[PDB]
């Protein structure tokens, strides 16, 4: 091992764990908690950013002084990744957008950027690399999202034969835009769902389980090469998802059956918005399509991670969206939805 | 000695539950006491008159950004003053600290005879003063 | 002599009473504590987190120490009635964010020189 | 005078240089490991050695009160040149 | 003093305070143990713990003393004694412009009758002392923490309490509010054992033992 | 003057033979498994141990009980002793029985095959003080080293 | 296995309980060691310790037996029984 | 390679030549990944299968108590005796004495310096080796500052 790299201290803010993290796109939900755990135990974290440094300031109070270093970086410019990943031990890829922008397409951020980050990291000579791809990554999937993850996973697998690809099923949390999605749905009158959402079962997993699983994969000496899939502890129908979360918000649930094409159209008008889109046609397919089960792929329990139940952590997000009439209502009042778990 | 509803609670004092130092720092801390030894280049034996309480030196790692000796044990610089050793151990029992006792290394009472520096047969005579 | 003056609990029995109404106040305090204090933990884990602290101090035989502790018990209790503490203040009892402490000999050997 | 390490970074006056395999160097990326150009090693050797004609000399360091406390250095060793530890400048006998 | 370096003396006051020192001694022989006036004209009354409330009452009430001002409450902790904490009061007599010091001793467990009744100023001074040192007094109105952090465990001023504390806190985004953790300093307190190894004062030296 | 030695050539991390048979730094896991894998499979005189010249007693107990459970009694030491006779049995056979303070009351000392002036400098200072004040006689059997 | 490897006869130089075992080793020792040249007879004489016999068997086994106030003949009786179970 | 710990980096007990137990205490933490020497073995015993009962410093300290009560009374010596038995126990086949003269391994200052691993690793101690074996020329460092 490197001479000035041996772990030291009792896993604190000022301790030394020996991990030179290089999380990319940490200015997001997964990045926010990943740098938190890395900073918490004590590890040098190199965070490249593309957006305004002001938005990245909320990661400043996340580690000891000189442990978090912010670096400018660009996806297209190869030299940008080289500077970030040169003095590194683990480079983990968290870059990727749920929608499409004019400069960066779906394949650009999910295949091209992962292709660049994997090739440079291997060429630089980092010992480990972790890549994030959707658990539903499928080449024939109707959504360009999941197709891009599949080919992107294939590319980083070939370029980096020791990369530990991560397969989260459906992430949820405070700023998760997954249950915040259905929570924000009450604004547009009722709750539009395709065929009332009775033919879609998902298995969401909360942030800390996948987040802790990341560093556990970093600490795991045998995690290289594997394709761990981080999945939740329970499976519920899509109708049960909206039923439960609206109940925790106590907002009046108004089920609204929709044809598939009308919902596809609705994403089109909402994609026109020059600002950040609310609903996209790709998001239409993702919420419509159902989560798949991959028992052969190792799960999250193999890394000593217990999948937190959705009902236990759903209140942490639903409190913000609920009204004053039930703001102080607890979580025992609501009852977890019908689990159709495997 | 002052009879005010006195009850014979003669069990060893256990103030650890009240002072509430963390579990790692009440069991896994060998508290040791001695009398400090006088610095040899000094001639200051008066500093060897007090019983002193110490701890065990834990990990002292170097800071990445500068190189420091960041410590994780709060009881690193803590030393305590005791007139006699029985008071020092008495504090250890009430604070339930695993105690170790050394003894006061009193100096030998050496006999100095300057007249012996110039003898007729004894080897103690000095070749140069 | 070794005989000492008690404050309130002359022996174990009255001290055992004093730890009992602490439970009496605490048990009906946890429900509306979560309710008022905007807490996201349920009553179930609220109740037993009052529990294990009784066994956290379930070894002292001196009545005074139990009495010295009974005052602090209602002190933290009263501090919770009138919202004096903040969310983090009571969260400090809920050990939640620290790394788990190693227990078996293999773990501390693999961690460092910690004895 | 400042040298350059094999990794391309200037070495400090104390001789400290970051190893090429070191990870903490990245703090120098987009920044500088600035080094005091006036090396105290090279800032005192070229000062002339004085040739006072006396056995013992009081060195003050210049400026009187502003200099270092007065130190009485000795000049009897012919092979070695006397010097004041406070300042480091040289002293010498008048060639005797 | 023809020499302008050393501090002068007020022998008239020193004897005068000493006369009042023995004055209190006969008045309350049950409670006082020894009364001493220091070289720098500071006469201290040393009273028994259980008689804390009467002596303070006597000084507040008696015409010849009339000490009605609770200047300060201190309980200086000395680990070498059996009952470590020695509780020290501080009184000022306005009519006789003189200061008196009455003090007791009390271990970590022995309770003292609160002097709030005899001195309303003792109230908040009482809330501080139990916080810093941990000596509970009896029947205090609202004896409760008023200095340390809400729920901060342990009395910080105790000798066994390290100056750096036991816990430190830091904001955490994964829970979105501040949270505590064991203290782990960037720089430890570098102890400076600078005490001179040579005797400094022959006058105050303890007898051989 | 030995603190500088504590800074030179320090064993920092476990090292095991690589694919080419060269020592390379590795984690404790591989080193522990490799030694354990080669230990429990061997028994009797196959497993042995040699103590150093500066090893502490607690380590010696550790190997004594470790080789206890593997049927190994070949726990050798660098120092060699004529075990014939009492040897290890009687502690008076090898102990400085009179204690180092005893020289200041002796009369004659026989140094057999040793250089206490160099082997044990603190010892030789004690005889020197004894020879100075007590006029204690000395005589050795060995090379006439000063 | 359960065979003799060495003995550890801990005793005190002054305790009356250790006097009996002390009575044993003044004269009845040279024949015991000569009878078991391979068996080392370790005498750990630490003060204020009641005499303890420690027979270390194979496989990391070590049984103890009391010798408090055991006179010269009877300390020989119990240790010979340990010798009798040499395997 | 099993990185142990030096005496300054170890809180353990040695015994002098007179059979007096003296315990050292840790002053500097062992560098890097090195751990306590006995902590290594106890970890080794657990990973091998024949786990030792003792796991902390006091537990192993009690182990030397039950195998050798002498080396736990710190600074307290124990009077050695039964020399009347040791000599009569030697008393045997009487192997002869070699004609080789008695030559101590340490005869000069130089070989006295170069004994143990720490002395071998040390550099300033090696400067003293150069001083005695050569003289004053090379070893004279200019004491300018
Ligand atoms: N249910 C889900 O949402 C699932 C998501 N994932 C993937 O895991 C990751 C989680 O991201 P999350 O932390 O939630 O952040 P977001 O998805 O909310 O935002 C994207 C993240 O990547 C960065 N980023 C976005 N676009 C680019 C770009 N073109 N170039 C470089 N960086 C970019 C963002 O910072 P910035 O905008 O400043 O560049 C931010 O850190 C994403 O890749 C996501 O697709 C995987 C499985 C499930
Ligand atoms: C999150 C909410 C706010 C924060 C909430 C958590 C913080 C507040 C905690 C308040 C409770 C406090 O810790 C403990 C106390 O009151 S007293 C302990 C007395 N200990 C003994 O006397 C020793 C012997 N103990 C026994 O014998 C039995 O175990 C016992 C008597 C305890 C009960 O069993 P039985 O009656 O004998
Ligand atoms: Zn000068």
């Amino acid at each position: 091992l490197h001479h000035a790299l041996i772990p030291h201290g009792k896993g604190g803010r000022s301790s030394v764990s020996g991990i030179v993290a290089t999380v990319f796109g940490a200015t997001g939900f997964l990045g926010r908690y990943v740098v938190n755990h890395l900073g918490r135990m004590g590890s040098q974290v190199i965070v490249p950013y593309r957006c305004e440094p002001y938005d990245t300031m909320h990661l400043r109070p996340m580690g000891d002084l000189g442990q978090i270093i912010f670096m400018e970086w660009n996806g297209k410019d190869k030299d940008s990744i080289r500077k970030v990943v040169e003095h590194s031990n683990v480079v983990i890829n968290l870059v990727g957008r749920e929608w499409e922008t004019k400069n960066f397409d779906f394949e650009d951020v999910f295949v091209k950027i992962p292709h660049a980050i994997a090739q440079v990291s291997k060429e630089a000579g980092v010992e480990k690399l972790i890549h994030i791809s959707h658990l539903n990554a499928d080449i024939k999937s109707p959504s360009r999202y999941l197709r891009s993850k599949a080919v992107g996973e294939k590319e980083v697998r070939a370029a980096f034969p020791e990369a530990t690809i991560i397969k989260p099923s459906d992430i949820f949390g405070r700023e998760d835009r997954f249950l915040n999605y259905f929570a924000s749905m009450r604004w547009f009158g009722g709750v539009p769902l395709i065929s009332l959402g009775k033919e879609t079962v998902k298995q969401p997993v909360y942030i800390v389980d996948v987040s802790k699983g990341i560093i556990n994969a970093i600490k795991d000496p045998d995690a290289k090469g594997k394709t761990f899939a981080f999945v939740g502890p329970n499976r519920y129908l899509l109708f049960d998802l909206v039923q439960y979360i609206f109940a925790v918000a106590y907002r009046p649930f108004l089920p609204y059956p929709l044809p598939h094409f009308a919902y596809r159209w609705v994403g089109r008008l909402f994609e026109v918005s020059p600002f950040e889109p609310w609903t996209t046609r790709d998001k239409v397919e993702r919420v419509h399509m159902s989560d798949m089960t991959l028992p052969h792929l190792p799960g999250l329990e193999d890394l000593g991670i217990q999948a937190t139940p959705l009902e236990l952590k759903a209140i942490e997000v639903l409190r913000r969206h609920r009204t004053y009439r039930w703001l102080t209502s607890e979580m025992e009042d609501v009852k977890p939805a019908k689990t159709v778990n495997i | 000695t002052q009879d005010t509803q006195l009850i014979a609670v003669d069990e060893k004092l256990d103030i650890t539950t009240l002072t509430g130092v963390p579990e790692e720092h009440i069991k896994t801390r060998k508290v040791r006491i001695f009398v400090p030894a006088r610095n040899n280049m000094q001639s200051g034996v008066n500093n060897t008159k007090k019983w002193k309480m110490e701890f065990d030196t834990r990990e002292r790692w170097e800071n990445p950004l500068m190189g420091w000796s960041s410590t994780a044990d709060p009881l690193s610089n803590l030393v305590l003053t005791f007139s006699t050793k029985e008071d020092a151990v008495a504090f250890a029992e009430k604070n339930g600290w695993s105690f170790d006792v050394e003894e006061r290394k009193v100096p030998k009472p050496k006999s100095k005879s300057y007249g012996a520096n110039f003898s007729w047969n004894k080897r103690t005579r000095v070749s140069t003063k | 002599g070794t005989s000492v003056k008690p404050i309130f609990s002359r022996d174990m029995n009255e001290a055992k009473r004093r730890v009992r109404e602490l439970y009496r106040a605490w048990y009906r305090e946890v429900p509306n504590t979560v309710h008022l204090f905007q807490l996201d933990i349920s009553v179930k884990q609220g109740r037993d987190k009052v529990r294990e602290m009784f066994m956290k101090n379930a070894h002292v035989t001196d009545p005074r120490v139990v009495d010295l502790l009974v005052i602090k018990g209602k002190m933290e209790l009263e501090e919770t009635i009138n919202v004096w503490k903040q969310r983090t203040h009571i969260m400090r009892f809920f050990h939640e964010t620290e790394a788990p402490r190693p227990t078996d000999f293999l773990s501390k050997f693999y961690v460092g020189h910690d004895p | 005078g400042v040298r350059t390490s094999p990794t391309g970074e200037k070495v400090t006056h104390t001789g400290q240089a970051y190893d090429d395999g070191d990870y903490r160097r990245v703090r120098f990326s987009d920044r500088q490991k600035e080094v005091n150009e006036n090396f105290a090693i090279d800032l005192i050797a070229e000062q002339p050695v004085s040739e006072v004609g006396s056995r013992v000399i009081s060195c003050d360091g210049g400026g009187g009160a502003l200099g270092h406390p007065r130190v009485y250095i000795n000049l009897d060793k012919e092979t070695k040149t006397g010097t004041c530890g406070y300042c480091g400048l040289q002293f010498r006998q008048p060639h005797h | 003093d023809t020499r302008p370096t050393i501090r002068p003396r007020n022998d008239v006051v020193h004897k005068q305070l000493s006369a009042f020192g023995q004055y209190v001694a006969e008045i309350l022989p049950k409670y006082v143990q020894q009364v001493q006036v220091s070289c720098f004209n500071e006469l201290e009354i040393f009273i028994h713990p259980d008689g804390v409330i009467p002596v303070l009452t006597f000084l507040r009430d008696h015409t010849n003393a009339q000490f009605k001002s609770l200047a300060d409450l201190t309980a200086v902790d000395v680990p070498t004694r059996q009952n470590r904490f020695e509780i020290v009061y501080n009184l000022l007599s306005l009519r006789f412009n003189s200061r008196i010091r009455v003090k007791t001793y009390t271990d970590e467990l022995t309770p003292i009758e609160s002097s709030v009744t005899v001195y309303k100023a003792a109230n908040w001074y009482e809330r501080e002392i139990w916080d810093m040192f941990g000596v509970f007094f009896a029947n205090h109105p609202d004896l409760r923490r008023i200095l340390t952090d809400y729920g901060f465990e342990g009395h910080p001023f105790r000798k066994d309490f390290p100056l750096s504390g036991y816990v430190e806190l830091r904001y955490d985004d994964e829970v979105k509010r501040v949270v505590a953790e064991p203290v782990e300093l960037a720089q430890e307190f570098r102890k400076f054992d600078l005490n001179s190894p040579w005797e400094a004062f022959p006058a105050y030296r303890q007898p051989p033992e | 003057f030995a603190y500088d030695g504590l800074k030179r050539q320090r064993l920092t991390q476990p090292m095991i033979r690589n694919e080419k048979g060269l020592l390379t730094y590795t984690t404790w896991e591989d080193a522990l498994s490799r030694v354990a894998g080669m230990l429990q499979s061997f028994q009797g005189n196959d497993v042995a141990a040699i103590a150093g010249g500066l090893v502490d007693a607690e380590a010696l107990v550790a190997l004594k009980d470790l080789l206890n459970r593997v049927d190994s009694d070949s726990l050798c030491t660098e120092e060699v002793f004529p075990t014939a006779g009492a040897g290890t049995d009687l502690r008076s056979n090898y102990l400085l029985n009179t204690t180092i303070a005893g020289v200041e009351e002796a009369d004659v000392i026989l140094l057999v095959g040793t250089n206490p002036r160099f082997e044990a400098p603190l010892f030789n200072a004690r005889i020197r003080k004894s020879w100075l004040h007590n006029d204690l006689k000395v005589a050795l059997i060995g090379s006439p080293v000063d | 296995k359960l065979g003799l490897r060495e003995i550890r006869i801990h005793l005190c130089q002054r305790s009356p309980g250790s006097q009996g075992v002390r009575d044993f080793i003044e004269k009845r020792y040279v024949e015991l060691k000569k009878a078991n040249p391979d068996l080392p007879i370790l005498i750990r004489e630490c003060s204020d310790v009641q005499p303890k016999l420690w027979a270390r068997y194979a496989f990391g086994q070590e049984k103890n037996v009391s010798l408090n106030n055991f006179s010269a003949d009877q300390v020989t009786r119990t240790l010979e029984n340990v010798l009798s179970g040499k395997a | 390679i099993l990185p142990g710990a030096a005496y300054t980096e170890k809180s353990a007990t040695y015994v002098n030549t007179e059979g007096r137990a003296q315990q050292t205490k840790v002053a500097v933490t062992p560098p890097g990944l090195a751990r306590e020497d006995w902590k290594i073995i106890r970890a080794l015993s657990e990973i091998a299968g024949m786990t030792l009962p003792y796991d902390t410093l006091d537990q192993v300290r009690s182990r030397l108590e039950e195998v050798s009560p002498n080396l736990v009374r710190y600074d307290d010596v124990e009077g050695a005796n039964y020399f009347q038995q040791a000599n009569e126990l030697s008393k045997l086949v009487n192997q002869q004495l070699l004609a080789d003269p008695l030559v101590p391994p340490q005869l000069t200052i130089k070989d006295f310096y170069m004994t143990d691993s720490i002395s071998r690793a040390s550099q300033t101690m090696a400067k003293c080796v150069k001083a005695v074996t050569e003289g004053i020329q090379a070893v004279e460092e200019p004491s300018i500052c």
Side-chain angles (χ1 to χ4, degrees), chain D residues 59-62 68-69 71 73 83-89 91:
Chain D
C59 163
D60 177 274
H68 60 68
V71 153
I73 68 74
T83 175
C84 169
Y86 280 68
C87 62
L89 68 103
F91 271 75

Side-chain angles (χ1 to χ4, degrees), chain A residues 12-15 32-33 36-37 40 61 174 208, chain E residues 168 170-176 181 184-186:
Chain A
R13 186 144 162 123
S14 278
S15 288
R32 264 249 310 288
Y33 286 49
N36 188 337
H37 298 58
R40 184 225 320 287
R174 305 248 154 77
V208 78
Chain E
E168 82 166 290
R170 159 208 43 119
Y171 178 80
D172 217 279
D173 215 316
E174 87 195 89
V175 280
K176 209 152 282 303
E181 41 212 354
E184 171 188 316
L185 292 196

Side-chain angles (χ1 to χ4, degrees), chain A residues 132-152:
Chain A
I132 270 61
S133 156
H134 209 110
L135 179 139
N136 315 336
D138 165 40
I139 321 184
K140 65 183 42 54
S141 88
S143 78
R144 318 234 291 265
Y145 194 113
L146 306 183
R147 321 205 272 269
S148 318
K149 320 307 297 292
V151 51

Side-chain angles (χ1 to χ4, degrees), chain A residues 7-11 40 312 315-317 319 327-332, chain C residues 31 34-36 38-45 97-99 101 114:
Chain A
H8 279 102
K10 218 170 308 310
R40 184 225 320 287
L312 207 150
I315 181 83
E316 298 193 326
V317 200
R319 288 252 206 201
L327 171 79
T328 177
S329 299
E330 302 89 275
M331 58 311 311
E332 319 105 358
Chain C
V34 161
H35 203 317
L36 180 78
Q38 259 316 119
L39 257 205
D40 279 54
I41 193 63
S42 98
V43 187
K44 179 41 210 93
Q45 330 88 325
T97 199
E98 62 295 349
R101 209 75 276 143
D114 174 22

Side-chain angles (χ1 to χ4, degrees), chain C residues 16 19-20 22 26 30 49-50 53-54 57-60 66 69 73 93-94:
Chain C
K16 259 54 165 317
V19 314
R20 278 193 276 274
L22 274 146
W26 277 121
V30 154
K49 208 47 157 321
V50 182
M53 272 206 207
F54 300 119
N57 317 130
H59 37 120
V60 54
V66 192
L69 182 171
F93 304 101
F94 279 26

Side-chain angles (χ1 to χ4, degrees), chain D residues 18-67:
Chain D
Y18 256 60
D19 183 308
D20 91 343
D22 208 73
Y23 81 92
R24 324 172 311 280
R25 149 178 49 251
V26 47
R27 279 126 53 170
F28 297 158
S29 73
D30 318 55
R31 282 70 139 291
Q32 75 286 350
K33 170 185 231 271
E34 78 291 356
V35 152
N36 174 317
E37 301 66 350
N38 315 67
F39 266 42
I41 273 292
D42 295 39
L43 260 281
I44 192 49
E46 65 291 347
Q47 309 290 331
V49 55
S50 171
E51 213 81 13
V52 317
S54 272
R55 294 261 301 299
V56 46
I57 300 299
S58 77
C59 163
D60 177 274
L66 325 189

Side-chain angles (χ1 to χ4, degrees), chain C residues 15 22-23 36 49 53 71 75 78 82 86 91 104 108 113:
Chain C
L22 274 146
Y23 226 137
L36 180 78
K49 208 47 157 321
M53 272 206 207
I71 331 177
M75 224 149 284
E78 183 310 325
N82 41 19
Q86 287 275 167
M91 281 335 297
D104 55 48
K108 338 159 197 54
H113 324 77

